[PDB]
Amino acid sequence: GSLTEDGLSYKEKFVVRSYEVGSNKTATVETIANLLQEVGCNHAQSVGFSATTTTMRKLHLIWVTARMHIEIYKYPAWGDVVEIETWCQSEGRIGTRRDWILKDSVTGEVTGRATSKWVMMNQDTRRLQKVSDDVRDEYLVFCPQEPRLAFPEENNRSLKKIPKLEDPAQYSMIGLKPRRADLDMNQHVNNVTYIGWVLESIPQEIDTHELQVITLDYRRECQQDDVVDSLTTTTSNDSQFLHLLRLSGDGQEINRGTTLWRKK
Amino acid sequence: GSLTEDGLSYKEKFVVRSYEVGSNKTATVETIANLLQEVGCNHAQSVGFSATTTTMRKLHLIWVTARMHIEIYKYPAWGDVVEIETWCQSEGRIGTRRDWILKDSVTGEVTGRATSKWVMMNQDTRRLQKVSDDVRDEYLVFCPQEPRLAFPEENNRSLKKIPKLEDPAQYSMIGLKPRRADLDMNQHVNNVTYIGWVLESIPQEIVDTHELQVITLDYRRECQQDDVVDSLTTTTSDSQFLHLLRLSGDGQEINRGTTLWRKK
Ligand SMILES: NS(=O)(=O)c1nc2ccccc2[nH]1
Ligand SMILES: NS(=O)(=O)c1nc2ccccc2[nH]1
Ligand SMILES: NS(=O)(=O)c1nc2ccccc2[nH]1
Ligand SMILES: NS(=O)(=O)c1nc2ccccc2[nH]1
Ligand SMILES: NS(=O)(=O)c1nc2ccccc2[nH]1
Ligand SMILES: NS(=O)(=O)c1nc2ccccc2[nH]1
């Protein structure tokens, strides 16, 4: 992979692996989400990070995902090469946004797009905070200054408000817990695991559809010793679902989201 | 990746990804096992397999792993390039063996090695069978004829007999169940998931202070999509452990194995 000529975005190519595909012999949405995370990490490394700035590491501050939105038109097949372009944009004092464009390397056509909202949090107390000028000045030189949106459209699905699922849920998967493969290098549950857990409450029959859109709001983390319940209710040619992940015991919300599926 | 000059082995290079590493910023043993599986698949594709041969497909016969043995001297770091060489050998009428050699792409030094025993099974009845003669002749042209062993030495750990763990187990992780990310493209639980489940009963104190050096795993029965597994471990000693995976209900054995850990 490499930074583009202007140094304001990063591209990388990936060959889809045998264990990365589902029943249709195409990449799962979790494989896609792992590749978005990998190209984001490679971009941060290429521009001098290790994505905490100098002032952030001094103040024990980190970027955390508040929302992730992915739209897939075509999932790449096993053995196919997918090219992904990523970049960051400042959103004033609210936080930052990382966007992605996925393309078929052979045709050059756009096969998917993703966007994510990131907030500044103290690593120790987990308290959120606005972006200071000192921190902002350190990362603005790595972002395009004019707007560059993966989802330009006026009433697009990436910024919609998500409601809280009401009991009883239509579908559920109970007692989900992470294993060591679900953790990142800092021993925290990887963001992609939550997408997998959301999808566990979708019935196997829904074999007949392809996932087109997924929007996920991250509220709280699942710790290593926590157990999660995954809840889903149909809200709808296309099937739409409302999702909720909550801790098995007290019922504390950890995530909420929506999925849109289209008939194969 | 590509077949070597003689067409009797296959090599491929992999760049270690951010989500593929553990707390030491080096590849997990599950990442290694996924890469061995991927290079094995690429080898079978390069030599004309759609690793079932024409006669196997007509007879509804498949290759299944009976035993896997991996020894790691150094785990590649995040961003490092690891080169893996693989080949197959015929073992008379018992079945086939696939071997692997892992190397640091920069130094050319051997950083690990693996071996696996495969048996022929009817995909519908799950009945084991010897390899006939028509089937052997179809894949012997893709194997070196003289012996080529990843573990040549006499009395090597790759061929040792593994006993059955006696109750009570010293350590345990109960109620493990696969999610969709744990399945392969044929909707069966991926072999690497079983390695993860075995490792779930090792205490965090051991993982934090030791590195896994050797793992031998015997595969006896499948965990189906609706099954629940219990992972059991007892120290038999470097630290050595004896492992057992069994179904949560009836206690039916699915796997047994051993691990050897070196103090960091
Ligand atoms: N944006 S947040 O609500 O502070 C937040 N982001 C998260 C990402 C993963 C897990 C928990 C999180 N909590
Ligand atoms: N994204 S998160 O899961 O909320 C999170 N919080 C963290 C605190 C310290 C180190 C890594 C972290 N990751
Ligand atoms: N994957 S985990 O839930 O973080 C975890 N922590 C563990 C500590 C001891 C034994 C197994 C474990 N699995
Ligand atoms: N060799 S076997 O005992 O027939 C066998 N191999 C297997 C691999 C994965 C899961 C179940 C298996 N059963
Ligand atoms: N290796 S296994 O998990 O025992 C297995 N059995 C299978 C039968 C049909 C298709 C794939 C299979 N994989
Ligand atoms: N990953 S799995 O255990 O094969 C599985 N099968 C499922 C069927 C319906 C809903 C969730 C599921 N998860």
3D structure, described in words:
Chain A: This is Oleoyl-acyl carrier protein thioesterase 1, chloroplastic. Chain A: Plays an essential role in chain termination during de novo fatty acid synthesis. Possesses high thioesterase activity for oleoyl-ACP versus other acyl-ACPs. Substrate preference is 18:1 > 18:0 > 16:1. Chain A: It comes from Arabidopsis thaliana. The structure is a homodimer of 264-residue chains. By secondary structure, chain A is mainly beta. The first copy, chain A, folds into two domains: 2-159, Hotdog Thioesterase (Thiol Ester Dehydrase, Chain A); 171-263, Thiol Ester Dehydrase, Chain A, CATH 3.10.129. The first copy, chain A, is built from four helices and twelve strands. In chain A, strand 4 (81-90) and strand 5 (96-104) form a beta hairpin. Chain A is globular, with a radius of gyration of 18 Å. The interface between A and B is medium-sized, with 34 and 35 residues. The structure holds 1H-benzimidazole-2-sulfonamide (6 copies). One 1H-benzimidazole-2-sulfonamide sits between chains B (178-180, 182-183, 225) and A (173, 200, 203-204).
Bound molecules: 1H-benzimidazole-2-sulfonamide
Strand content of chain A: 35-45%
Label the overall shape of chain A. Answer: globular
The CATH top-level class label of the largest domain in chain A: Alpha Beta
For the secondary structure, the number of strands of chain A is 12
CATH architecture of the largest domain in chain A: Roll
| Discrete helix count of chain A | 4
CATH fold description of the largest domain in chain A: Thiol Ester Dehydrase, Chain A
Gyration radius over CA of chain A:
18 Å
Find the structural class of chain A using helix and strand composition.
mainly beta
Question: Gap between N and C termini of chain A, in Å?
Answer: 33 Å
How do the helices and strands follow one another from N- to C-terminus of chain A? EEHHEEEEEHEHEEEE
Q: In which range does the helix fraction of chain A lie?
A: 10-25%
Subunit organisation of the chains: homodimer
- Most extensive interface: A-B, 34 and 35 residues
CATH superfamily of the largest domain in chain A: Hotdog Thioesterase
What count of structural domains of chain A?
Answer: 2
GO molecular function (chain A): fatty acyl-[ACP] hydrolase activity
Main location (chain A): plastid
Enzyme class (chain A): hydrolase
EC number (chain A): 3.1.2.14
